[PDB]
Design a protein around this ligand. Structure first.
Ligand SMILES: Cc1cc2nc3c(=O)[nH]c(=O)nc-3n(C[C@H](O)[C@H](O)[C@H](O)COP(=O)(O)OP(=O)(O)OC[C@H]3O[C@@H](n4cnc5c(N)ncnc54)[C@H](O)[C@@H]3O)c2cc1C
Ligand SMILES: Cc1cc2nc3c(=O)[nH]c(=O)nc-3n(C[C@H](O)[C@H](O)[C@H](O)COP(=O)(O)OP(=O)(O)OC[C@H]3O[C@@H](n4cnc5c(N)ncnc54)[C@H](O)[C@@H]3O)c2cc1C
Ligand SMILES: Cc1cc2nc3c(=O)[nH]c(=O)nc-3n(C[C@H](O)[C@H](O)[C@H](O)COP(=O)(O)OP(=O)(O)OC[C@H]3O[C@@H](n4cnc5c(N)ncnc54)[C@H](O)[C@@H]3O)c2cc1C
Ligand SMILES: Cc1cc2nc3c(=O)[nH]c(=O)nc-3n(C[C@H](O)[C@H](O)[C@H](O)COP(=O)(O)OP(=O)(O)OC[C@H]3O[C@@H](n4cnc5c(N)ncnc54)[C@H](O)[C@@H]3O)c2cc1C
Ligand SMILES: Cc1cc2nc3c(=O)[nH]c(=O)nc-3n(C[C@H](O)[C@H](O)[C@H](O)COP(=O)(O)OP(=O)(O)OC[C@H]3O[C@@H](n4cnc5c(N)ncnc54)[C@H](O)[C@@H]3O)c2cc1C
Ligand SMILES: Cc1cc2nc3c(=O)[nH]c(=O)nc-3n(C[C@H](O)[C@H](O)[C@H](O)COP(=O)(O)OP(=O)(O)OC[C@H]3O[C@@H](n4cnc5c(N)ncnc54)[C@H](O)[C@@H]3O)c2cc1C
Ligand code: NI
Ligand code: NI
Lengths: 166, 166, 166, 166, 166, 166
């Protein structure tokens, strides 16, 4: 493994570019291990919490314990902004340095699924994001989890390029 | 490379544990490539934006273009929640499956640094997070960037363990 | 990195499974760095040659010098079987050992594209398989390469599982 | 990890070079996870099938179920061309781009080993290519596999270099 | 993965630089998987033996069987030089080639811990260097190992840079 | 990537095994990035210094500045013990934990090559250990380096296995 170092790089733009292609945005979502869920707290300030997730058919699924911090907040305002990003890559253009990454952002409202069988279905979507293993859930386990359904009302993607030239 | 698959895993708890050790929380921050900045939007809903950053001496530094989306929001409410996380690891206990990750969260208020030399200093903290290369910034480049200073008022860390047993 | 060794494994089946999903077969093709081109030689015996390639719209593209070995053969019989495979993965089922891989196979006939502009187009499909860089081709370079077009008449995929149990 | 991209690359030669050194060709064979077996089908056209293998003392060993597709073909013509290749490497010469790989090719005739103990011996050569684990084979397992012995009559190696310059 | 090759590199200096920062030297020690223990043999010549180790609070811990080669030597001279190094990195300065690594060196004297409980404590420091797993040690296992304690009297670090220019 | 953790492991033996096969010992040497050179210091105590190296035909080659620390020592006693090791691997036997590595050790005497052309030859052996690039050496560069030749009088290899069982 090797590195390229420069003595005389001059900082320049960053430009973001919008990703239009829905499959490409979904690809980012599907590649991500965690997501960052923004919730407005009880004082009107941001709260960002990382969480595991599943995604299918314009819908995000999460799960948590049944209380409290983020739960109290969602009960007051259930609008969430869920953001995803993969690491940056470093690209040298031939000289020129560019550090590039991409992200997805989903906005929607949180429901807590109550039906026991719907909860299992959703829990399966979440687990399938991380393993091919078969999961069972006892009734008491399904009872002691809140399963979040977030139909995605707006889904966007962005490429960010941070640039420097010699 | 190899994988372990099970036919009969039963979902169980997730538990979060609080990370008290400040150096350990800072280690997470220092390991992270990007951070997820939560801002309350103009309607009171969450907006989470990934961004590059630097961290030193209980202070986060970011930079952006001088407008608009996130800028308009910060001008109305400059409280931000900035969250960091490293990938999950998979641990098999010997049977038992555990998927474990850790995160940091910083809460503080955003200033936009106006002094040209302070802006360069801060830009250096940000760049040093990603490379050892020396960056210069022309005056016009320093002018055309907003450099965000976020003294961290509360910094917390959390380990999350998602568990299943045979 | 770690390994699991067993003292008492008993060899069992191999089973192949057919992959029906065309996008999944194309995914294998798109993941592969090289392909293995089977040509019948002048005596009726197999000749398998690895080659770089591009794939779009049920068509494979290759390129070579304008002579000789494989060229003489194709001039007598231009039917080729082009095969692709990704490495094996090792999966332990929980005990049981399974070594699993997947492959694609395309059958079609080889044309040598003569039009200079068609040759460039095809050469672009091939290069785009390996890099995002822009390639130019002088006229003399386009002249001194044979560009193979292989419309795919049959495309199949297979998963192979080699199994052992304790 | 980083990438180098160019705006103005001009495609040039590919050259193959012959690898004379037998130990070097055997090294390629020994590094490979799978091999691509070319068989002439019943209509005289190529059939290329990937397969696992072992190699010792100028002899390749494979195994399969006792029927059918490739078996019917080998019963008509047991000449096979078995080809191996490792991934390409990318080399920048300092500018100049070169994508380089190497391959081996073995030509020989297929026997199906009938003696039960010879079959086990050969199966061991194959397994030792992939693991250090001890494999047993019940009699019924040895019965229900065809074990292919292919003394190698011609073994060749080739380095291929695909080149572009600025 | 890619490589950069040059036709016309001119060998130049190597320079070592002293690492003053104790935490940085300890970081090297903590990163290392093995250490190389120098012992003067019975004829006055060097003997360098690799070994696993633990490090805490300016003290190195090792363990071995209770005899013989290195044991006889230490009984005559228990001064040891224990050296650590991480792989080299390759850095291209933009042209210029630099191959850089770092090492730590600890000098101290070896005791063999006799108290059974002290031996377990030390064995724990060693194991914690390699895994988070809980180890037990039967009395007979603790008896049949020599546990080496080496208070570090001098600890130094060095960066070595091997350089070539175009 | 995943890990296996145990609650109840019992420490056991370490056993070393002697590696007899000269090609296998040379393979370890050839795989190593650095070597650890033991020299007896001026007081009769060990000094272990890491260094780059080349190996061909039972001979090790190193290079350094023309002074001082290790040079003064070698002028009094030019016997060196040069040791090599590759990382450990972790092997789970199926339960049982084994951490395994291998090392080589070469004993010989150090000459400093004086002839300018011999020095270049040797410097080439060293560089070829790390890159395929062509190195030149001006006369003044060859003058300002000591090139060490160490015909290997004894070369040995050892596998070390550190074991724990459930
Ligand atoms: C990548 C990864 C995946 C995760 N997946 C899930 C999951 O799917 N479901 C789930 O319930 N949890 C998950 N977690 C943890 C998730 O962030 C927790 O729900 C959260 O930490 C507890 O949520 P809360 O709002 O109820 O916290 P509370 O206990 O109500 O808040 C207590 C306080 O602790 C601090 N805090 C809370 N969360 C974090 C954070 N993670 N990092 C640093 N400080 C924090 C804040 O100061 C907060 O106000 C995951 C964590 C990681 C790192
Ligand atoms: C890891 C990485 C690092 C980055 N580092 C920086 C940096 O340090 N400084 C910086 O200014 N930018 C950075 N970006 C991009 C940062 O997220 C942008 O500032 C943001 O995308 C534009 O911000 P804004 O609020 O001004 O967007 P606006 O242009 O005001 O918003 C337009 C709309 O586009 C969508 N959108 C905005 N951001 C995203 C997002 N990134 N993902 C998906 N959809 C989005 C939303 O629907 C938004 O309302 C980075 C991006 C990545 C992925
Ligand atoms: C992965 C990789 C990618 C390649 N991509 C291309 C490409 O896209 N275009 C291209 O033209 N070539 C490519 N090659 C080389 C391709 O295999 C050559 O065209 C081939 O080696 C020469 O083809 P031929 O039939 O004209 O050989 P000839 O020179 O006519 O045959 C001479 C003899 O040498 C031996 N031989 C030929 N090919 C090989 C082989 N590769 N391995 C071992 N022995 C061999 C055989 O005994 C053969 O009969 C690639 C090679 C590798 C390893
Ligand atoms: C790397 C890896 C290693 C393998 N190792 C072995 C092994 O050692 N022994 C073994 O018996 N098999 C192995 N296989 C599978 C080997 O390719 C099968 O024997 C083959 O797929 C079935 O062979 P056949 O000629 O009897 O097929 P048949 O069932 O007779 O043919 C049916 C049809 O299915 C299609 N087809 C057949 N093979 C493939 C292929 N693999 N890819 C895409 N389409 C195909 C063709 O259209 C073919 O005509 C391996 C597969 C992979 C990917
Ligand atoms: C990285 C790794 C970690 C290790 N960790 C430990 C550990 O913590 N504790 C421990 O006791 N051992 C460990 N070993 C092995 C350690 O080097 C042995 O103690 C040593 O090999 C036997 O030591 P000795 O002086 O008692 O050898 P003896 O059996 O007394 O010497 C016999 C002769 O064999 C040769 N020889 C000895 N050691 C080596 C060597 N390793 N490489 C090549 N030839 C050799 C020499 O010619 C020596 O004179 C490790 C080995 C590796 C490679
Ligand atoms: C893997 C790597 C490869 C190297 N390859 C070479 C090479 O081939 N040629 C070469 O000349 N040097 C090389 N070095 C450095 C080699 O170890 C130096 O020669 C050495 O550091 C200076 O040697 P000396 O005996 O002349 O030191 P001196 O300057 O005479 O000693 C000064 C003091 O500094 C300390 N010290 C010396 N060496 C080290 C060490 N490396 N680690 C920690 N403290 C130390 C000791 O306390 C020593 O007594 C390499 C270093 C690394 C890490
Ligand atoms: Ni590079
Ligand atoms: Ni494992």
């Amino acid at each position: 493994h090797h590195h390229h170092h420069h003595e005389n790089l001059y900082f320049q733009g960053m430009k973001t570019i919008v990703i239009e292609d829905k499959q490409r945005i979904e690809s980012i979502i599907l590649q991500a291990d965690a997501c960052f869920v923004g919730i407005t707290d009880l004082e009107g300030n941001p709260y960002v919490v990382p969480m595991n997730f599943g995604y299918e058919n314009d819908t995000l699924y999460l799960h948590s314990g049944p209380e409290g911090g983020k739960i109290e907040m969602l009960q007051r305002n259930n609008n969430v902004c869920i953001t995803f990003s993969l690491g940056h890559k470093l690209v040298y253009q031939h000289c020129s340095y560019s550090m590039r990454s991409e992200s997805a952002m989903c906005r929607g409202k949180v429901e807590f699924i109550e039906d026991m069988e719907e909860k299992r279905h959703a829990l399966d979507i979440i687990m399938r994001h991380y393993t091919k293993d078969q999961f069972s859930y006892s009734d008491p386990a399904v009872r002691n989890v809140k399963v979040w359904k977030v139909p995605v009302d707006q889904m966007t993607g962005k490429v960010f390029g941070l640039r420097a030239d010699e």
